[PDB]
């Protein structure tokens, strides 16, 4: 499913003109400040829920479990611990 240069396995290409300029002719950091602020904000905003929801859920689960475990091994949690074992 992959060939090599000159016969890569693309369907025939026609009608596309491609243009670019030399690395020496370009400013490599053109538009960096806009990208760093606005582009990163856009990209992060659009993915934020997919990270926040599972992280926040599993952190909550852990927090509840670790707090209960801590409480069961205090004096106050003696009776509840006895039942739990």
């Amino acid at each position: 499913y992959m060939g090599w240069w000159g016969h890569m396995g693309s369907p025939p290409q026609k009608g596309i003109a491609g243009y670019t300029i030399s690395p020496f002719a370009a400013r490599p950091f053109a538009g960096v400040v806009h990208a760093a602020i606005f582009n990163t904000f856009r990209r992060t905003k659009n993915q934020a829920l997919f990270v926040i929801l599972p992280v926040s859920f599993f952190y909550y689960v852990w927090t509840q479990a670790s707090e209960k475990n801590e409480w069961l091994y205090t004096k106050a949690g003696r009776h509840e611990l006895a039942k739990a074992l």
């Binding site: 499913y1 693309s10 369907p11 025939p12 290409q13 026609k14 009608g15 596309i16 990208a35 582009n39 990209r43 659009n46």
Partner: protein, 124 residues
């Protein structure tokens, strides 16, 4: 999964009034959040092509559809590497999201599946 399967199940749902009433609105939001249209793709451009059946379907595309698909893949690749989204006329509008490939792959698979059945026939 085969395109045939996907198309048949979808048709069962679209038939049932109840089912369509609840599934079609969900499917439309799913497609909006999917966001492939914001890279100028049509849905069919995303289907896995590294299979004999799909390579045969792609070879049967009319030349113009084939040349346009090549351009959309190259354009989407350039948006991907630049970390940009399409703007203006590069965004695929819902009316441009046509199933150009589905009829070809359904014909390729119809023959492939008939061949499998007929390879297992038993003279009665």
């Amino acid at each position: 999964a085969s395109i045939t399967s996907v198309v048949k199940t979808s048709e069962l749902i679209l038939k049932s009034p109840l089912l369509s009433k609840i599934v079609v609105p969900l499917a439309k939001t799913y497609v909006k959040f999917s966001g492939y249209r914001q890279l100028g793709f049509k849905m069919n451009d995303l289907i896995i092509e590294e299979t004999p059946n799909m390579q045969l379907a792609l070879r049967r595309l009319p030349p113009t559809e084939s040349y346009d698909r090549v351009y959309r893949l190259i354009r989407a690749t350039q948006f991907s590497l630049s970390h940009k989204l399409a703007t203006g006329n590069d965004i695929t509008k819902p009316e441009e999201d046509d199933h150009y490939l589905i009829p070809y792959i359904l014909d390729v698979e119809a023959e492939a599946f008939e061949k499998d059945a007929l390879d297992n026939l038993e003279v009665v």
